[PDB]
Design a protein around this ligand. Structure first.
Ligand SMILES: Cn1c(=O)n(-c2ccc(Cl)cc2)c(=O)c2cc([N+](=O)[O-])c(C(=O)C3=C(O)CCCC3=O)cc21
Ligand SMILES: Cn1c(=O)n(-c2ccc(Cl)cc2)c(=O)c2cc([N+](=O)[O-])c(C(=O)C3=C(O)CCCC3=O)cc21
Ligand SMILES: [Co+2]
Ligand SMILES: [Co+2]
Lengths: 377, 377
């Protein structure tokens, strides 16, 4: 069922913004590890005395990395005269965010028809406002409301290239890395209580509903903006990792970003080649039992060679009633066991491919729990 | 002249510690960009609930990267019961350092005969104490005094492997990168006033003295611990970059680290291959005039091919009366135009090679100023 109740016209995931202490180092690391090009910058060299922001790009995927300069550089400025290209930025909020959370996502940004309207309707409908609609160079409108913890849902809309005040990067420094990642599939929040988070967020967007945890997935009208939310289940055999997140994150925040690849096998080869030379590490590979059992559930979907490749790469495969999902999880992206990344590719549900095709891996909890057990053997 | 007045027995540069907001991302970036192995860690996986610290290594060069976890993780601890492997660490000092300076060096560490003695004698001789001598597992003694700004000079001594509480890293994650860098040659501070900084530091160590700026170089008995210090010259034609450092750094701090390579040509090839894929950028290359003029000053030292290689790589060459110096400078290592790195190799002064052989590049100010001018042509 899909009531299509979006209170305003939502288009797609536009970009994800990380709040860092040093944007250069994180961005350069992410670029290498994930195969993302350097596309745009806003910093001293572009006249921004407030924050340093570097945009990484792979297909439609836009990762933004932002860190504050010294407040001294812009002490003579006020908001009317600001040189920051993202007017919602605030030294104190940024430093406080990073001190409280470490490296993490500050904004999940979606493109909408009209960001001023989407903010008004949102706030009229329960959203806690975070930064009011501001119009940049009469060309783009940006607005922010609280999503969960210190993560904001950021609305962006264009009259008619990322943002005003950004510049396209020197082609010399923009080496065309690409490991196959194409767009953001979903962005997942961890909260201490699912119900109120859902009710709050579903309340002001109109989005509809699509082991260690309980979770639920909110989705826009065409189900291409997918916002799962997790909560822990306490008392369990092995401690809830949603709880471990909340402890080390100092509260709710973004847990993981799921990035769609147009060739999950090439992506995972390319990322794993780089795991130990600056890139990202992947979760431990499941035992061969998980892959012996793969034939009986997806043998009609992937060849034995395609299945053998999965085993080389530690890829996970799950299937619902509409499609098949290939997925894998990185280890945490930073010092803390908090945010991580998921690499995704979906097969099926073509009419284009509809969102969520294959689910989010629900069946892999049972398949792993079992295959762990039948591997002791 | 070398009076050899060290007030205590200094051995060599032991390690450099960066204070970061996220140690993983900086370290992984530095590893790739500079060809440094992952050698040791102290973090949650080793039971450290206080800070995350990762050691990178290339030859004798030891870069340490440290970031704080949430103070909540260790709220029940006191200094006697601490789980931090570096007992001088302090969340508040670290967060304050990084908020004030961004990514930068917190400690310049030298190995000494006896760190307890070196601290006492230092403090008896004017040093502002920063962390008193602490003995770790009855095996290593560490102590800290203020060097300049918020940079500490850290004494380390061993009775008899980096530090207690660190673990050697999984050989799977320890890929043996190596671009030829072998040790730290000198670590340079920028201060607003040279005289008092010199007098202070020479005062408590016994170290002796070895455009935009004035500078002077302090050195231990065998001149293998070299600590230049810069100050600006105001009013000049083009603004002092020592001043630009002080403005963007919020005061004095470490300006650059000069790393010795056993093959500056292979290092610079390897680092430049990686400049645009996660590594480090290098300063703009000098005009061909600088290389046409190279033959007449170092043509007795490097072949025409060796000189041609220099031109490919942007290498700078200078010469004093004892030896020849090959050097190049990176662009800043982080968001701010503050700390950068210098790649060095020295030819001459063999008896072993004596420290400082070839100087620090003094002659290259004139040679560049000129070659810029004779290139307009
Ligand atoms: C597939 N999968 C998985 O297999 N394991 C796993 C690993 C090892 C062992 Cl032994 C057993 C199970 C996970 O732990 C796991 C955790 C998460 N998560 O925390 O969100 C997700 C996930 O992506 C997700 C949700 O579950 C519901 C909300 C939508 C959503 O996106 C998927 C997971
Ligand atoms: C060699 N050299 C250089 O050529 N230029 C340069 C670049 C481009 C143009 Cl056009 C003209 C000149 C520098 O700016 C420069 C700056 C520094 N520094 O700031 O310390 C150093 C340096 O390493 C150093 C000192 O100078 C004295 C204390 C010991 C020490 O280590 C060397 C430099
Ligand atoms: Co997921
Ligand atoms: Co130097």
């Amino acid at each position: 069922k899909n009531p299509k109740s979006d209170k305003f016209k939502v288009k797609r995931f536009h970009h994800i913004e990380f709040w860092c202490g040093d944007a250069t180092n994180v961005a350069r690391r992410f670029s290498w590890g994930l195969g993302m090009r350097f596309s745009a910058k806003s910093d001293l060299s572009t006249g921004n005395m407030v924050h340093a922001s570097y945009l990484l790009t792979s297909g439609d995927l836009r990762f933004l990395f932002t860190a504050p300069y010294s407040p001294s550089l812009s002490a003579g400025e006020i908001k009317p005269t600001t040189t920051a290209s993202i007017p919602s930025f605030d030294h104190g909020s940024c430093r406080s965010f990073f001190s409280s959370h470490g490296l993490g996502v500050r904004a999940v940004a979606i493109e909408v028809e009209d960001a001023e309207s989407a903010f008004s309707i949102s706030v009229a409908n329960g959203a806690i406002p975070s930064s009011p609609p501001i119009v940049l160079n009469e060309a783009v409108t940006i607005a922010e409301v609280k999503l969960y913890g210190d993560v904001v849902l950021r609305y962006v809309s264009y009259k008619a290239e990322f943002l005003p005040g950004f510049e396209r990067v020197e082609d010399a420094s923009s080496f065309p890395l690409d490991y196959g990642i194409r767009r953001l599939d979903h962005a997942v929040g961890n909260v201490p209580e699912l119900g109120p988070a859902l009710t709050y967020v579903a309340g002001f967007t109109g989005f509809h509903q699509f082991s260690g945890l309980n979770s639920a997935v909110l989705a826009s009208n065409d189900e291409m903006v997918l916002l799962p939310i997790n909560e822990p289940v306490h008392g369990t055999k092995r401690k809830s990792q949603i709880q471990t997140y909340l402890e080390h994150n100092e509260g709710a925040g973004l847990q993981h970003l799921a990035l769609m690849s147009e060739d999950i096998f090439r992506t995972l080869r390319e990322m794993r080649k780089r795991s130990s030379i600056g890139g990202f590490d992947f979760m431990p590979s499941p035992p061969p039992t998980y892959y012996q059992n793969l034939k009986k559930r997806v043998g009609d979907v992937l060849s034995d060679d395609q299945i053998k490749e999965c085993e080389e790469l530690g890829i996970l495969v799950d299937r619902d009633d509409q499609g098949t999902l290939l997925q894998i999880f990185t280890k945490p992206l930073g010092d803390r066991p908090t945010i991580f990344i998921e690499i995704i590719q979906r097969v099926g549900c073509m009419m284009y491919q509809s969102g969520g095709c294959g689910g989010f891996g629900k069946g892999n909890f049972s398949e792993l729990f079992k295959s762990i057990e039948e591997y002791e053997k």
